[PDB]
Amino acid sequence: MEEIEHRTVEVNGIKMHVAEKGEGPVVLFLHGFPELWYSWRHQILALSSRGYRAVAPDLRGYGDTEAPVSISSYTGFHIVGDLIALIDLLGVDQVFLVAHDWGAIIGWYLCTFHPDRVKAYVCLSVPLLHRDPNIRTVDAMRAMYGDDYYICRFQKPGEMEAQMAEVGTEYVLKNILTTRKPGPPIFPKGEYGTGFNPDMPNSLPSWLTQDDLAYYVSKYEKTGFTGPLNYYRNMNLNWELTAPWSGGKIQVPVKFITGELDMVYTSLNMKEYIHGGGFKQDVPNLEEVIVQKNVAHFNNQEAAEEINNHIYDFIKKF
Amino acid sequence: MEEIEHRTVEVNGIKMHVAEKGEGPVVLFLHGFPELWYSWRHQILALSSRGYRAVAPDLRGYGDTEAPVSISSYTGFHIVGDLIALIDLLGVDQVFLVAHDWGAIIGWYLCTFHPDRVKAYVCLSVPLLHRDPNIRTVDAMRAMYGDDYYICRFQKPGEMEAQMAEVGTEYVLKNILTTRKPGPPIFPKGEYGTGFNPDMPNSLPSWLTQDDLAYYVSKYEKTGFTGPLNYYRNMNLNWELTAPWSGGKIQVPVKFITGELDMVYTSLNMKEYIHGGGFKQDVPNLEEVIVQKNVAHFNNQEAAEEINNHIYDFIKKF
Amino acid sequence: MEEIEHRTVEVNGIKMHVAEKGEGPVVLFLHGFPELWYSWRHQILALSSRGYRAVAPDLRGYGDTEAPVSISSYTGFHIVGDLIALIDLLGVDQVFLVAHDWGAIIGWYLCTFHPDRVKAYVCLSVPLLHRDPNIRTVDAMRAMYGDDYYICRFQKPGEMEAQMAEVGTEYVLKNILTTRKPGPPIFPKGEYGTGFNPDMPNSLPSWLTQDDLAYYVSKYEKTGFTGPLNYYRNMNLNWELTAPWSGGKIQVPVKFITGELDMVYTSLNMKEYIHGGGFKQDVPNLEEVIVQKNVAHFNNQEAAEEINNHIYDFIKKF
């Protein structure tokens, strides 16, 4: 871990924290919510020792990366803009892409805008967001799960920040990271709860030490949740602005991996999209879908070694 | 339908009924239990009109094909023996393979012994039976679900024939063809009763006409069930005899398609095998898995047009 | 649940409700306080499926089993008297033994008086009550935790009953069943109050359904708590009468399994007995201790499937 290099770079008008290790073809990791570059610690060290340069930034609004002030600075276009500028800084034409959760949505955008710059993509948790021309992203979510669906509850500016502050930062992080409840996260009215996890464990699972937890906590105490929450607040705008890619396909080779208990996999008709043919239709070079038994949302941490091999076994084919 | 040609051929020392229509590369269809060539009727008509020669035999012991007397005449080697002799009579080096249920197991054996004779394989319902070197096929089923699991109950000679004879042939065929109940079929002690289906309609689903059922019934009224049942009675022997191929891989390109409600998909940890990596490991050129929403076991009949397109879009790439 | 047989049998001069399903070697389940045969619902269905005869009575004083009027009818001897008469009616020489809480204490007496009739023992929550020749059971408890310790509070006849009548039976059952509080249950001075759970959830844990709680409530609204409380009111008498087995060992194979948050595990120095050598000293064929993380007292219900596998994997060896 002490061997991981840390630097700040200037990309797309912002300052970004970039963690890296190794030499070789770039493997670019994009973390999700509410995570950090640190979520990729095991993969950084693993792929580093296999002849690749591992590169994991904090995304815009996260950790030690600058958090622009206005909510409108968090469209997928801004965030891909940072990454394209980063890849140019790395001085390579193509990267291998590995991404998870919100990082995977951003990953999909990157593949949409610039498939030429991604050799292959290991996508965790979140399949491509199929753009339905008849209904906006968040609208479809609300129609299915109502106002207390977490993504709906994440919309109103300031409100979730306030609810999270009531229960405190450490509680929010522990609540989310340790959750194993499948299905749509629905919050209790007017407050946090018991947000994502009504059965919070006494002890932390073996994959998440208390030090690990402390790392996240120290970073989120500094930054708060507004930057990260702003990605969600732009989902309908993202839907609008991506009209040019309506009905299109992604030709980048893809390996998809989710935990069986991941709330993403177990909601939003995601199974039908993944296994029914839709996913393969949108993503013609999707080579393989893997469902990990008794693994939940944070599969790169909970199933770290399997994810390491799955990444290497795929990217070596190129 | 009356434009389909029907003939008897001599193959591997038996007389086999072959249904055929069209000219072009052979697409060879293999029905399962408790079915007939007739299950493929929509596929026969659809594929023959797309520039292919559709060939659907009744297998050994079914329909208008000879039924040997001995239980030991129904190992997978006997049945592939018939089919290899048949492909030879057709005068072709390769076939496209399409199969379902017991037909699919036989299709796997065919791809195991002569992958060269098979261009591509559309496999319905039943994935490769991975040979566990430590445990026999039927023993593993008994261990998981006990003696009343249907395949266990199918073992003792004469018993299921008798039990079926008491409820009647039509009832058996209707009971089985109409079922939509997921999970392992467990029979009631000492009788046929209701399983496979505790919730018979009894109005037939739209995909199965009373004329369809009548045709099935007239064949099984003639043949009884012993021939078909004997396939299951050789599963442990098939396991023993295939020791030369343990740890083997199948290199034939495969497209796997199952109804979501199929009892095969929803038992025996088949989901773990299909989605976990086991299937793709054994079958490296497994290009795609499709799980059909709200469709049960008999997917080629229930989702005919869907299946027709799925077959066509696959085999046209070769 | 409906395939479960329920009969009344005459054992040891009392009428006993017995719940039964499946066939094969007998597996006998002994429930604790304040439970029922119904606590074993998942284990009954699971194990009768794998070819065992699952048998689970309501113990004396519980549910639909007769409840003798006198306190003196509730020694361990009376209850093992019941169980031996039962195993005789079952017509086997040995049974497999699974027990939890007070049932486990009785089960220990059974193993003490007749190890010949027990092939192996799966013990949940309560280890062997070591007979300290120097001090009676409740005396030691009272020395350690004072008069408001729950077992001491259960001694004076009529008192806990009345405190439970105020506050009502549904509260008592929910309060006890939902508790996850480790350590010694210590009651408020003159009433039930919060007793067992100072922090009761508004919502049942996922393992307990409203139908579940209603079942318990129903029987306990009919029977009351006297019968079950009477077991505690004979702990000292049991200590006296077991003088003949002072210093003895127990040779029955035992698998012990506790939730790490069980009040039993986290009080009365149970940890030092279980892991310190003492439990192994008293029970030489104790194969392993299984502490289940993030599980509380009622482990057969909270980790139902996991315990199904634990039982099965153990009684396999025998």
CB pairs under 8 A between B and C: 6
Least Cα distance to C130 among C281, C261, C233 occurs for C281
How many C-beta neighbours within 10 Å does residue C146 have?
11
Peptide bond connecting B57 to the previous residue in cis, omega within 30 degrees of 0: no
**Of residues B58, B101, B262, B282, which has the active-site annotation?**
B101
> What is the C-alpha to C-alpha distance for residues B103 and B123, in angstroms, rounded to an integer?
9
Tokens of A82: 């940072």
Which residues 146-205 on chain C approach chain A with CB closer than 8 angstroms?
A: 203, 205
Number of folded domains that form chain B = 1
Using a CB–CB cutoff of 8 Å, tell me whether B9 touches chain A: no
> What is the C-alpha to C-alpha distance for residues C58 and C230, in angstroms, rounded to an integer?
15
Catalytic annotation present for B17: no
Angle between helices A169-177 and A159-167 (to 10 degrees): 90
Which residues in B264-287 are b (16+ Cβ under 10 Å) and which e? bbbbbebeebbbbbbbbebbeebb
Task: Write down the residue that tokens 């479809």 correspond to.
Answer: A140
Least Cα distance to B297 among B189, B149, B175, B141 occurs for B175
Tokens of A142: 């609300």
Instruction: Identify any residues that bridge with B10 across adjacent strands, giving them in sequence order.
Output: B15
Q: Give the chain C residue nearest B144 (alpha carbons).
A: C50
Q: Please name the amino acid found at residue C142.
A: R
Residue from C2, C23, C49 whose CB has the most chain B CBs within 10 Å, to mutate:
C49
**Is residue B312 classed as helix, strand or coil in its secondary structure?**
helix
With beta carbons less than 8 A apart as the criterion, state whether C255 and C117 touch. no
Angle, vertex CA A148, rays to CA A35 and CA A78, nearest 5: 40
Which residues in B57-72 are b (16+ Cβ under 10 Å) and which e? bbbbbbbbbbbeeebe
Tokens of A60: 């815009």
> What is the C-alpha to C-alpha distance for residues A63 and A221, in angstroms, rounded to an integer?
10
| Chain centroid, CA C168 distance in Å | 23
Which CATH number does the domain housing residue A135 bear?
3.40.50.1820
> What is the C-alpha to C-alpha distance for residues C97 and C82, in angstroms, rounded to an integer?
15
Q: Please name the amino acid found at residue B149.
A: Y
With CB atoms and an 8 Å threshold, state whether C49 touches B147.
no
Catalytic annotation present for A42: no
With beta carbons less than 8 A apart as the criterion, state whether A297 and A179 touch. yes
Per the structure, the complete domain to which residue A80 belongs is given by: 1-318
**Contacts of B among chains (3+ CB pairs under 8 A):** A, C
Using a CB–CB cutoff of 8 Å, tell me whether C296 touches chain A: no
With CB atoms and an 8 Å threshold, state whether B289 touches A291.
no
With CB atoms and an 8 Å threshold, state whether C203 touches A198.
yes
Q: From start to end of chain B, where are the E strands? A: 5-11, 14-21, 26-30, 53-57, 95-100, 118-124, 254-259, 286-292
The alpha carbon dihedral of A146, A150, A152, A157 has a sign of positive
Cα separations in angstroms, C77 against C81, C83, C110, C116: 6, 10, 9, 17
> What is the C-alpha to C-alpha distance for residues B48 and B25, in angstroms, rounded to an integer?
10
**Is residue A198 classed as helix, strand or coil in its secondary structure?**
coil
**Is residue C16 classed as helix, strand or coil in its secondary structure?**
strand
Least Cα distance to B33 among B150, B130, B159, B200 occurs for B150
> What is the C-alpha to C-alpha distance for residues C66 and C12, in angstroms, rounded to an integer?
11
**Is residue A114 classed as helix, strand or coil in its secondary structure?**
coil
Tokens of C253: 């194979």
**Which helix or strand (DSSP H or E) is residue C174 part of?**
helix C169-178
Using a CB–CB cutoff of 8 Å, tell me whether C261 touches chain A: yes
**Is residue C288 classed as helix, strand or coil in its secondary structure?**
strand
| Chain centroid, CA A152 distance in Å | 18
Three-state DSSP string of B75-121: CHHHHHHHHHHHHHHHCCCCEEEEEECHHHHHHHHHHHHCHHHEEEE
Q: Give the chain B residue nearest C52 (alpha carbons).
A: B146
Technique of determination:
X-ray
Tokens of A116: 């030429």
Nearest C-alpha of chain B: how many angstroms from A114? Answer: 25
Catalytic annotation present for A62: no
> What is the C-alpha to C-alpha distance for residues A102 and B54, in angstroms, rounded to an integer?
48
> What is the C-alpha to C-alpha distance for residues C24 and A252, in angstroms, rounded to an integer?
57
Residues 6+ apart with CB under 8 A from B248: B112, B131
Cα separations in angstroms, C65 against C238, C301, C316: 22, 22, 31
Q: Tell me which residue in A271, A276, A291 faces B276 most closely, judged by beta carbons.
A: A291
Cα separations in angstroms, B171 against A264, B193, B215, C203: 43, 10, 14, 47
> What is the C-alpha to C-alpha distance for residues B109 and C126, in angstroms, rounded to an integer?
54
Which residues in B130-148 are b (16+ Cβ under 10 Å) and which e? ebeeeebbbeebbeebbeb
With beta carbons less than 8 A apart as the criterion, state whether A73 and A60 touch. yes
Least Cα distance to B147 among A173, C8, C50, C34 occurs for C50
**Which helix or strand (DSSP H or E) is residue A299 part of?**
helix A299-302
Tokens of A181: 């409840």
With beta carbons less than 8 A apart as the criterion, state whether A286 and A25 touch. no
Which residues 85-104 on chain B approach chain C with CB closer than 8 angstroms?
A: none
Peptide bond connecting B202 to the previous residue in cis, omega within 30 degrees of 0: yes
Q: Give the chain C residue nearest A202 (alpha carbons).
A: C294
**Is residue A260 classed as helix, strand or coil in its secondary structure?**
coil
Show residues of chain B in contact with A289, CB under 8 Å. 275, 289
Which residues in A109-146 are b (16+ Cβ under 10 Å) and which e? bbbbbeeebbbbbbbbbbbbbebeeeebbbeebbeebe
Angle between helices A76-90 and A102-113 (to 10 degrees): 70
**Contacts of C among chains (3+ CB pairs under 8 A):** A, B
Show residues of chain B in contact with C49, CB under 8 Å. 145-146
Biggest CA-to-CA distance, chain C: 50
Q: Is A91 exposed, middle or buried (0-12, 13-18, 19+ CB in 10 A)?
A: exposed
Least Cα distance to B123 among B139, B107, B112 occurs for B107
Residue from B274, B275, B280 whose CB has the most chain A CBs within 10 Å, to mutate:
B275
